[PDB]
DNA sequence: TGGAGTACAAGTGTGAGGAAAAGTAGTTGGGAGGTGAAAGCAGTTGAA
């Protein structure tokens, strides 16, 4: 499960090899990386 | 090219088993036919073989598994199923291989797609190379079921079935060795013989001389003049069958002959089904957000009150129903201006006979004179 | 006046929603576009008839072969009587034969008398000019063009006691300059190929070209269409080709190339409307209504509409309509390839104000296609129009009043041969079927009286046994002939192969004959799932195949009954290919020929992949 | 497809928020007998935010939020290669008003230059400046100072007084 | 019959244009060396000419310095006989490389004889063949005032690959004349002037096939026919909702600094404001000196319409319209 | 009567005309780049 997000339409997005860095719904070049369920720990202080 | 031609061969054979119900042994009949043309490839050395294949090669080696099984399918049905896009013939290079396309050169993709349609009897002439590169004589049997042929041709024109045997006595009288309307073979060169040596086309010229001889030579005065006007305009009546609208597509593709621009006199409802057929051409056939914004503003389905769910009981009559309008129209059953008014039906049976069999005019006209001065020839 | 101009060009294509707003705050139509609005205009024919009589190209030096318009002769230049409509047309063998009244439609006269002057050259153009409303009359003369000459005729003082139309003449002025001339107009003003001249017409038929002329000769134009018209009466001619329009004043010394149409169009036709100012121009891709100018009558190019049909042989006819507040201008383009028409309805208002409505089309007669369409002046929103056509491969002149309110010769001249010994011997087969149809109706009627009998049941008992011996012989005829690696008859019997008459009862035999076999080498193809290419639909049973075929020939035959039985039975004698061997037969040869090619041919012989 | 760039895009992309500069020429030959007019592209000139030429010009604080800006987006600056820069304001002399100034750096210029001199900073209607200085020399001579192309030109006054209009010696 | 939006290319129609435009050049270069004493072969021929690019035809108006004297030097047979022989004798070597009908086509078009077989006929492609079927019924049902059926033809026609700008925007009355479940027709013209609008220079040296300037492209010095269509139809619609500020801002953003027709409609936006606002419904501080802009914007934007090239306006009638606006201003 | 030319037909021989997805061709039209002072104060030379 590959996930980015476009900064314009907020449509979640995967990006394979030999692709343009563009969104597929809109034609937007800036495209930001989402976060997944991954463990980070914090001392509640 | 031999690799991708077999996959398209596999996919055309798959649909005939899947919907139209040609048997699960019929795949195996054409398979050895595909295997013995590979032995003709084995007959040539691989260095400069220059194999002779075309898009007619996939209609041909399907045709020689068909009448070997003595099926009622012919080239009249191989010219409808490719034009109405029922089996993947045209644009078969587009969607079929899906991996072998990226490695396939610019003329092995254009030969392999449906670029041109078979014209002026091109379809029979690949069967001549199919009966020469492997001999279809002395291996298989070139006999045709010609009664499955003439059964279809009666209800197309809706004459009384008296002409079935009247055509049949014509064929028995002319053919040496009465039976065995066999398919010809040609192994020699590119010289297609100007004789109309093919079995199914001979039946069509035998049928042209029946409708003249059984009406012009009738002293019995059984056939009235009101019936001639009632069989012409019973055959000159356009309706909404899946045959006549499948006939409309074949009338499109051929540019040279008349009744090619037949769409100027289409009715209202007949035009819609030509567009309802257009939902069977697009399923075969970065700068995508542009067209998506135009496909949004032109939705291909109707914007409101469509025709899929809550439409009707029926709109489309079946192929058995127009004959109850074709045979019930002709109530009359019990002259130098009549022998020209035999031609109003002689040319109107002709137009449906040229374009539904993919030959020109002179391919039937010279086919007459190789039969007309050959049936009268036997007496004197 | 509106807002849309450019000073050289002025456009209004189809449903552009044109550029002529003004925002009039009068609370009734607050916009004055170049478009009208009304209801529809469907056109119905009123058909009548007037008179009658290399291969991949067409020679553009022909213009017309017929003309017909109201005339006013010398006796009508004297008396109260004004207006008789005539026709000037060609007929005969090569069109070199040169030769009326309105009851309710246009018709040829009662006295059936044409004026046959003999001409020794093929006719390329026939026209009468028509006069202007500043000279008050309708012109009595007529100018035509032959292939070998240039002859000018004149109608003079026709009769009413016999409707006699007689001609005076000018002489045939042959090509003293030896070049073919193309299009004439009077309104002896001539246009030769590339060059032109202004002529003088004589009143003296009892026994010419001035010293003012010119040329438009384009070295980079390879066709020979040329065209001249008087424009706005001030001695200004408009000389055309398929490339450009030149405006030439032949009274002063002042020439102008006005239109230049070499880039993406040409010039197809230029009909001079009988109006003095408003005149249409037909190009390809656009229909132009370029009129003359108000201050100085030189040229003022007015509102035009684009024309989608493209062809090389397009012409136009154009007929006015006089109404109180406006004037319509219908625009019928036509071609030499098809039978269709294309029309448009412009409108002329008082301040040289132009508008548009839309477009429509009609259908015609299937013998050939039109080559020339001519309208009727008719001597003077429920629109009416009238015209008359002339089709190619024909010579008839129909009549039409459109208003708001296929036998090929080769399929006919190929049969019916005229010999004496061969006059009835073709009908020997006609006598042969009458010897067999009378026979083969009595042979079947043996079996028709047999209905659920034992006398017909014992045939099928012998039939299930006469096929059963030679078929197990045939099954073992394929094991002895199995060592081959190198076929179906159902005519093994010789009794009659016709002697049983039932659709359901033979299916009891053959399905029991199908339950006969269970071993290998014997395989039967389907019939209830394989017959269905004829009805093009479901055939759940072979019995109910016949059911709707019984509902098919009820009215069209005597007794309609036994023939439909026996053809369905003949399909069982024709479709039943039932001698396929079993699975040892394909499998022994799907690997043997796979061995005749090497390992390169193995993987390139591959199925079962998708 | 032609789209519309907002300055939130120029901060993620780390690029300049530029508007296109067009500049139509008058190529006249033989002093106006044949003119050749061509608008030309002169590159992007960066654009101050919430000005006439920004897309945030007359735009609600609701719509500044829907276009990724602060609700009270301030404007008044340029975005140049991601860095968000502005132009300092300068204190300069008042326009179009002569200033009687003594300056010790007037006798720097050489012989007989006194410490006195009028100075006016005259601006054109296109807000372009041109400073004239009117010196006083100790010999009674009064001069006129100006600049042109980084160079400094000393001239007498009564050559500039007498070239402006038709002057007598009482005028 | 109708024009079909196909980039159909055959070598037979491409050699016979490579054959004819060769023959035009030798016989025009022959006419050069007679009138004085008295490599592609198509890219060379069009360098003589100037393509119109605002119009199908370069209309040269008459009342100017384009007057000309008549050459009374007519063409006789003896001038026409040897000016055509030696270019025909110099054409003789490629006339065997061509087909047997091209040489027959050539000697046909050596003597006039305009052809009769059009390129839309003998293509036999099955993909262009359904194009030519669908284009004619498209133009027929719009002509036959049938709109639900033409909307179904046109939705099918644009989805076939190979089609052009030709069918797209011209007969988009099918949304404008539907108005029942419509997309209003003006969203499609917005689709046109957002993706096809380019400000490239018309390069004029390349030989244009299947894209033609005057009715489908939008270069510099030629505003597109669909761009100015989206101007007028969105101002007539802008009246008929009684948003004028939405387009008066929108027209302000392009500096179409060549053409004069966009300056009239940019005056006509404020002329609709000064007609609508000048009502006031009283039987008074800011509404009087806001219209005094809108009168002044119509007056200055009409002058720059006169400052640009040829587009005449009834500026005598507009000042009769504008003074009648002033009668309620006072 | 015994012997020659009309033309029904028929197979022999030779290239030519057609198709298309690919490529290279010919122009443009953008883009970021890359190829000294403010003041001393001294020593030294300055000059007719």
Q: What is the 3-state secondary structure (H, E, C) of E222-234?
A: CCCHHHHHHHHHH
Asked if residue A3 belongs to a known ligand binding site, the reply is no
Token pair for residue C44? Answer: 């119905």
The CA radius of gyration of chain A, in Å to the nearest whole number, is 14
Cα separations in angstroms, C300 against C281, C288, C293, C350, D126: 12, 11, 5, 16, 46
Q: Does B289 touch chain A (CB under 8 A)?
A: yes
Is the distance from CB of C126 to CB of C64 less than 8 angstroms? yes
The CA distance from E195 to the nearest CA of chain D, in Å, is 5
Beta bridge partners of B74: none
Q: How far is the CA of E100 from the C1' of F15 (A)?
A: 13
Residue B47 (CA) to nucleotide F18 (C1'), in angstroms, measures: 27
Residues 36-75 of D with CB under 8 A from E: 39
What is the CA D94 to C1' F40 distance in angstroms?
36
Strand F bases within 7 angstroms of protein beta carbons: 9-14, 16-22, 27-32
CATH number of the domain that A2 lies in?
2.20.28.30
CB C214 within 8 A of CB E70: yes
Nearest nucleotide (C1') to alpha carbon of D40: F29
Per-residue tokens: C577: 């290919």
- DSSP character for C348? E
Edge to edge, the sheet with strand A4-6 lists A12-13, A4-6, A31-33
Alpha-carbon distance of D133 to E109, in angstroms, equals 83
Assess D1–E contact: CB distance below 8 Å, yes or no: yes
Q: Does B283 touch chain E (CB under 8 A)?
A: no
- Residue D153's DSSP bridge partners are D146
Rounded to whole angstroms, how far apart are CA atoms B231 and B235?
A: 6
* CA B17 from centroid of its chain's CA atoms: 19
- Give yes or no for a contact between E301 and E266, defined as CB atoms under 8 angstroms apart: yes
For residue E11, give the nucleotide whose C1' atom is nearest its CA: F18
Q: Which residue is closest to F26 in terms of CA–C1' distance?
A: E206
What phi, psi does C245 have (nearest 5°)? -110, 130
Smallest Cβ–Cβ distance between D1 and the set A7, A27, A29 belongs to: A27
Residue A42 lies in domain: 1-45
> Using CB atoms, which chains have 3+ pairs under 8 A with D?
A, E
Task: Tell me the C-alpha distance between C539 and C529, whole Å.
Answer: 7
Token pair for B296: 């949004």
Residue A19 assigned ligand-binding role: no
CA C483 to chain CA mean position, Å: 64
Peptide-bond breaks in chain E following residues (C–N over 2.5 A): 38, 242, 283
Chain D residues lying within 8 Å of A7, measured CB to CB: 12
Cβ of C475: how many Cβ atoms within 10 Å? 17
Cβ count within 10 A of residue C245: 25
Question: Which of B9, B327, B333, B334 best probes binding to C when mutated, by most C CB atoms within 10 angstroms?
Answer: B327
| Gap between the Cα atoms of A18 and A29, Å rounded | 15
User: CA of B120 to nearest chain E CA: how many angstroms apart?
Assistant: 12
Nearest to C209, CA basis, from C170, C155, C239: C170
Q: How many angstroms away from the CA of A11 is the closest CA of chain B?
A: 14
Q: How far apart are CA C488 and CA C524, in angstroms?
A: 11
Q: Are C83 and C134 in contact (CB under 8 A)?
A: no
Please give the span between the terminal C-alpha atoms of chain E, in angstroms, as a whole number. 61
Give the span between the Cα atoms of E57 and C9, in whole angstroms.
Answer: 9
Cβ-based neighbour number of residue B291 at 10 Å = 12
Q: Which nucleotide is nearest to B373 (CA to C1')?
A: F8
Q: Separation of CA D81 and C1' F7 in angstroms?
A: 95
Task: For residue E201, give Cα distances in angstroms to C289, C461, E43, E213.
Answer: 31, 92, 18, 12
**Count of domains in chain A?**
1
Report how far residue C575's alpha carbon sits from residue C568's, in angstroms, rounded to the nearest whole number. 10
> B243: left (phi > 0), else alpha (psi -120 to 50), else beta?
alpha
Total CB pairs under 8 A between chain A and D:
7
Question: What are the Cα distances from residue C508, in Å, to B178, C400, C451, E5, E128?
Answer: 32, 67, 16, 62, 54
**At what angle are helices B2-18 and B26-43 packed, to 10 degrees?**
170
DSSP string, B161-184: THHHHHHHHHHHHHSSSSS--PPP
Q: What torsion do the CA atoms of C36, C37, C39, C43 make, to the nearest 10 degrees?
A: 20
- Angle between helices E225-239 and E244-252 in degrees, nearest 10: 150
Residue D59: which of D42, D47, D71, D48 has the closest Cα?
Answer: D71
Q: Using CA atoms, how far apart are residues C124 and C144, in angstroms rounded to an integer?
A: 8
Q: Cα E123 to chain center, whole Å?
A: 27
Find which of A19, A27, A28, A29 to mutate to test the B interface (most B CBs within 10 Å of its CB).
A27
Cβ neighbours of C31 (radius 10 Å): 16
Residue that has been written with the tokens 């006609």 in this structure: C430
Count A/B contacts: CB-CB distance under 8 Å: 6
Minimum distance, in Å, between the CA of residue A17 and any CA atom of chain B: 16
Contacts of C234 (CB under 8 A, 6+ apart): C249, C251, C297
- Give E95's DSSP letter: G
Experimental technique used to determine this entry: cryo-EM
> Which value, in Å, is the radius of gyration of the alpha carbons in chain E?
27
User: CA dist C148 to C172, C182, E76, Å?
Assistant: 9, 12, 16
Measured between CA atoms, the residue of chain E closest to residue C176 is E76
D near C: at least 3 beta-carbon pairs less than 8 Å apart: no
- Helix, strand, coil content of chain D in percent (nearest 5): 15, 40, 50
Chain-chain contact of D13 with A7 (C-beta, under 8 angstroms): no
SS3 content of chain A, % helix, strand, coil (to 5): 0, 20, 80
Mutate to test the interface with A, among D2, D3, D14 (most CBs of A within 10 A): D3
In angstroms, the CA of E205 and the C1' of F29 are apart by 16
Distance CA B298, CA B312 (A): 26
In the numeric block, which tokens belong to residue D129? 């400046």
Closest Cα in chain B, distance from residue E141 (Å): 10
- Beta-bridge mates of residue C89: C66
Q: Which residue has its C-alpha nearest to nucleotide F22's C1'?
A: B106
Task: Judge whether C252 is closer than 8 Å to chain E, CB to CB.
Answer: no
Q: Is A23 annotated as a binding residue?
A: yes
Distance CA E101, CA C142 (A): 41
Buried b (16+ CB within 10 A) or exposed e, C43-82: beeeebebbeeeeebbebbbbbbbbbbbbbbeebeeeeee
Using alpha carbons, list the distances in angstroms from residue C483 to C582, C589, E48: 15, 11, 81
The DSSP 8-state label assigned to residue B136 in this structure reads S
Give φ, ψ of B266 to 5 degrees: -70, 150
Question: What DSSP state is assigned to residue C181?
Answer: B
Subunit contact E195:D2, Cβ cutoff 8 A: yes
Q: Which residue in E326, E242, E228, E329 sits closest to E287, CA to CA?
A: E329
Which residues of chain A have a CB within 8 Å of the CB of B286?
A: 20, 22, 27
- Note the Cα A10 to chain centre separation in Å: 9
CA distance E162 to C27: 47
CB E118 within 8 A of CB C311: yes
CB pair distance less than 8 Å for D13 and A30: yes
| Protein CA at B44 to nucleotide C1' at F14, angstroms | 24
Binary contact (C296, E172; C-beta < 8 A): no
Scanning every strand, the nucleotide with its C1' closest to D44's CA turns out to be F31
Q: Which of A2, A25, E217 is nearest to B286 (CA)?
A: A25
Residue C354 contacts residue C348 (beta carbons within 8 Å): yes
Rounded distance in angstroms from the CA atom of residue D88 to the C1' atom of nucleotide F23: 57
CA distance C18 to E55: 16
| CB-neighbour burial class of residue D17 (10 A; exposed 0-12, middle 13-18, buried 19+) | buried
Tell me phi and psi for residue E88, to 5 degrees. Answer: -75, -35
Task: Report the nearest residue to nucleotide F21, CA vs C1'.
Answer: B106
The three-point CA angle D155-D161-D164 to 5° equals: 115
Torsion from C-alpha of C105, C107, C109, C113, nearest 10 degrees: 160
Token pair for E305: 């319409």
Instruction: Report resolution in angstroms.
Output: 3.1
């Amino acid at each position: 499960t590959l996930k980015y997000i476009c900064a314009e339409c907020s449509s979640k997005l995967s990006l394979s090899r030999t692709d343009a860095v563009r969104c597929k719904d809109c034609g937007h070049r800036i495209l930001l990386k989402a976060r997944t369920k991954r463990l980070v720990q914090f001392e509640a202080r | 090219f031999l690799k991708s031609f077999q996959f398209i061969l596999k996919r055309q054979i798959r649909w005939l088993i899947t919907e139209m119900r040609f048997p699960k042994e019929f795949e195996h009949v054409a398979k050895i036919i595909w295997l013995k043309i590979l032995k003709t490839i084995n007959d040539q050395p691989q260095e400069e073989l220059k194999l002779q294949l075309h898009m007619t090669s996939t209609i041909s080696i399907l045709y020689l598994a068909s009448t070997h099984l003595s099926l009622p399918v012919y080239t009249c049905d191989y010219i409808k199923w490719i034009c109405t896009a029922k089996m993947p013939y045209f644009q078969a290079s587009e969607i079929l291989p899906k991996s072998w396309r990226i490695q396939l050169p610019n003329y092995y993709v254009s030969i392999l797609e449906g670029s041109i349609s078979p014209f002026n009897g091109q379809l029979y002439n690949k069967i001549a190379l199919t009966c020469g590169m492997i001999h279809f004589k002395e291996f298989f049997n070139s006999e045709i079921s010609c009664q499955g042929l003439l059964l279809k041709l009666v209800m197309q024109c809706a004459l009384p079935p008296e002409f079935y045997f009247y055509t049949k006595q014509v064929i028995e009288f002319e053919e040496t060795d009465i039976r065995n309307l066999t398919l010809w073979e040609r192994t020699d060169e590119r010289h297609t013989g100007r004789v109309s040596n093919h079995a199914e086309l001979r039946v069509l010229s035998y049928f042209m001389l029946t409708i003249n001889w059984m009406l012009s030579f009738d002293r019995d005065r059984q056939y009235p003049l009101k019936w001639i006007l009632s069989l012409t305009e019973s055959l000159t009546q356009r309706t909404t069958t899946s045959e006549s609208i499948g006939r409309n597509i074949v009338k499109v593709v051929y540019p040279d002959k008349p009744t090619s621009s037949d769409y100027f006199q289409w009715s209202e409802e007949e035009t819609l089904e030509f567009l309802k057929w257009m939902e069977k051409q697009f399923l075969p056939t970065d700068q995508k957000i542009a067209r998506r914004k135009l496909y949004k503003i032109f939705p291909l389905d109707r914007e409101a009150n469509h025709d899929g769910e809550f439409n009707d009981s029926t709109h489309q009559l079946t192929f058995i129903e127009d004959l109850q309008e074709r045979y019930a129209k002709q109530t009359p059953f019990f002259p130098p201006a009549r022998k020209e008014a035999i031609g109003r039906l002689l040319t109107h049976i002709a137009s449906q006979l040229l374009v539904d069999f993919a030959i020109s005019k002179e391919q039937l006209k010279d086919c007459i004179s190789r039969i007309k001065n050959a049936c009268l020839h036997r007496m004197n | 006046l509106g807002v849309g101009v450019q000073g050289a060009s002025l456009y209004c294509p189809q449903e552009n929603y044109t550029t002529k707003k003004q925002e009039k705050p009068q609370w009734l139509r607050p916009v004055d576009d170049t478009l009208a609005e009304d209801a529809l205009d469907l056109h119905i024919v009123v058909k009548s008839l007037l008179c009658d009589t290399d291969a991949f190209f067409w020679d553009p030096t022909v213009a017309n072969r017929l003309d017909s318009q109201y005339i006013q002769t010398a006796s009508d230049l004297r008396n109260y009587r004004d207006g008789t409509e005539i026709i000037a047309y060609a007929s005969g063998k090569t069109g070199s034969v040169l030769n009326l009244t309105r009851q309710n439609t246009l018709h040829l006269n009662r006295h059936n008398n044409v004026t046959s002057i003999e001409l020794h050259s093929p006719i390329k153009s026939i026209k009468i000019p028509g006069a202007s409303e500043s000279i008050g009359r309708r012109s009595n003369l007529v100018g035509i063009i032959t292939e070998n000459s240039f002859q000018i005729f004149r109608i003079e003082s026709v009769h009413s006691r016999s409707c006699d139309v007689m001609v005076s003449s000018s002489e045939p002025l042959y090509f003293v300059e030896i070049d073919d001339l193309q299009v004439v107009d009077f309104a002896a003003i001539i246009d030769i190929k590339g060059n032109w001249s202004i002529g003088r017409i004589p009143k003296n038929f009892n026994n010419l070209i001035d010293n003012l002329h010119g040329t438009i000769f384009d070295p980079e134009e390879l066709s020979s269409w040329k065209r001249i018209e008087w424009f706005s009466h001030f001695q200004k001619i408009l000389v055309f080709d398929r490339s450009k329009m030149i405006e030439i004043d032949f009274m002063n010394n002042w020439q102008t190339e006005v239109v230049q149409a070499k880039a993406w169009s040409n010039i197809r036709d230029y009909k001079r409307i009988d109006d003095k100012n408003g005149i249409l121009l037909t190009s390809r891709e656009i229909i132009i209504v370029g009129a003359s100018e108000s201050n100085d009558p030189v040229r003022r190019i007015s509102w035009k509409h684009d024309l989608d049909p493209d062809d090389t042989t397009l012409r136009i006819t154009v007929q006015k309509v006089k109404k109180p507040d406006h004037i319509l201008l219908v625009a019928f383009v036509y071609s030499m390839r098809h039978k269709r028409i294309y029309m448009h309805v412009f409108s002329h208002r008082k301040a040289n104000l132009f508008q548009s409505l839309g477009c429509s089309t009609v259908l015609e007669i299937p013998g050939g296609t039109p080559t020339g369409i001519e309208t009727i002046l008719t001597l003077d929103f429920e629109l009416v129009v009238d015209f008359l056509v002339k089709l190619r491969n024909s010579s008839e002149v129909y009549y039409y009043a459109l208003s708001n309110t296929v036998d090929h010769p080769e399929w006919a001249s190929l049969f019916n041969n005229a010999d004496e010994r061969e006059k009835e011997s073709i009908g020997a087969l006609v006598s042969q079927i009458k010897l067999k149809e009378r026979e083969r109706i009595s042979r079947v009627q043996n079996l028709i009286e047999h209905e659920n009998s034992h006398d017909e049941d014992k045939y099928l008992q012998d039939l299930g046994y006469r096929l059963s011996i030679a078929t197990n012989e045939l099954l073992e005829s394929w094991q002895k002939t199995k060592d081959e690696s190198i076929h179906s008859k159902l005519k093994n019997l010789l009794e009659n192969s016709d002697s049983f008459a039932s659709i359901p009862e033979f299916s009891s035999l053959l399905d029991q004959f199908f339950q006969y076999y269970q071993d290998q080498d014997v395989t039967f193809i389907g019939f209830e799932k394989l017959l269905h290419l004829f009805l093009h639909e479901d055939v759940p049973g072979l019995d109910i195949f016949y059911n709707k075929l019984l509902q098919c020939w009820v009215l069209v035959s005597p007794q309609a009954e036994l023939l439909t039985k026996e053809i369905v039975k003949d399909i069982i004698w024709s479709l039943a290919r039932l001698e396929k061997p079993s699975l040892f037969e394909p499998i022994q040869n799907e690997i043997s020929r796979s061995l005749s090619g090497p390992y390169q041919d193995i993987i390139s012989s591959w199925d079962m992949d998708d | 497809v032609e789209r519309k760039v907002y300055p939130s895009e120029s901060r993620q992309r780390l690029t300049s928020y530029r508007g296109k500069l067009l500049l139509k020429l008058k190529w006249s030959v033989n002093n106006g007998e044949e003119n050749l007019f061509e608008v030309r592209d002169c590159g992007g000139l960066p654009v101050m935010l919430q000005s006439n030429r920004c897309h945030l010009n007359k735009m609600s604080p609701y719509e500044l939020v829907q276009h990724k800006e602060e609700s009270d987006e301030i404007g008044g600056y340029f975005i140049v290669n991601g860095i968000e820069k502005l132009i300092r304001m300068l204190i300069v002399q008042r326009r179009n008003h002569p200033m009687a100034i003594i300056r010790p750096s007037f006798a720097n210029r050489g012989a007989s230059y006194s410490h006195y001199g009028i100075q006016i900073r005259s601006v054109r209607p296109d807000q372009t400046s041109q400073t004239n200085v009117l010196h006083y020399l100790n010999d009674g001579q009064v001069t006129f100072r100006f600049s042109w192309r980084k160079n400094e030109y000393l001239v007498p006054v009564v050559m500039i007084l007498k070239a402006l209009c038709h002057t007598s010696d009482r005028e | 019959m109708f024009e079909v939006p196909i980039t159909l290319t055959n070598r037979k129609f491409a050699q016979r244009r490579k054959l004819k435009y060769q023959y035009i050049n030798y016989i025009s270069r022959r006419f050069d060396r007679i009138s004085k004493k008295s490599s592609d072969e198509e890219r060379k021929f069009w360098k003589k000419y100037e393509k119109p690019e605002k119009s199908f035809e370069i209309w040269r108006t008459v009342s100017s310095q384009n007057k000309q004297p008549i050459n009374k030097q007519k063409m006789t047979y003896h001038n026409f006989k040897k000016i055509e022989k030696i270019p025909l004798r110099k054409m003789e070597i490629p006339l065997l490389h061509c087909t047997k009908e091209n040489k027959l086509y050539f000697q046909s078009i050596s003597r006039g004889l305009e052809p009769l077989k059009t390129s839309t006929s003998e293509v036999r492609n099955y993909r262009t063949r359904h194009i030519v079927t669908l284009t004619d019924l498209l133009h027929l049902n719009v002509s036959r005032h049938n709109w639900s059926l033409a909307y179904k033809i046109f939705a099918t026609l644009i989805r076939i690959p190979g089609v052009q700008i030709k069918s797209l925007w011209g007969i988009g009355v099918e949304i404008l004349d539907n108005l029942s479940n419509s997309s209003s027709g003006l969203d499609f013209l917005q689709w046109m002037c957002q993706i096809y609008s380019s400000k490239s220079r018309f390069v004029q040296n390349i030989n244009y096939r299947s894209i033609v300037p005057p009715f489908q492209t939008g270069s510099r010095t030629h505003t597109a026919k669909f761009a100015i269509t989206y101007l007028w139809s969105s101002l007539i619609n802008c009246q008929k909702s009684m948003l004028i500020d939405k387009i008066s801002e929108w027209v302000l953003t392009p500096p179409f600094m060549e053409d004069a027709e966009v300056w009239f409609i940019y005056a006509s936006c404020h002329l609709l404001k000064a007609d609508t606002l000048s009502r006031q419904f009283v039987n008074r501080d800011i509404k009087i000196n806001q219209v005094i802009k809108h009168i002044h914007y119509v007056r200055t934007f009409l002058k720059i319409c006169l400052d640009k090239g040829g587009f005449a306006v009834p500026s005598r009638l507009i000042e009769n319209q504008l003074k009648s606006f002033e009668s309620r201003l006072y």
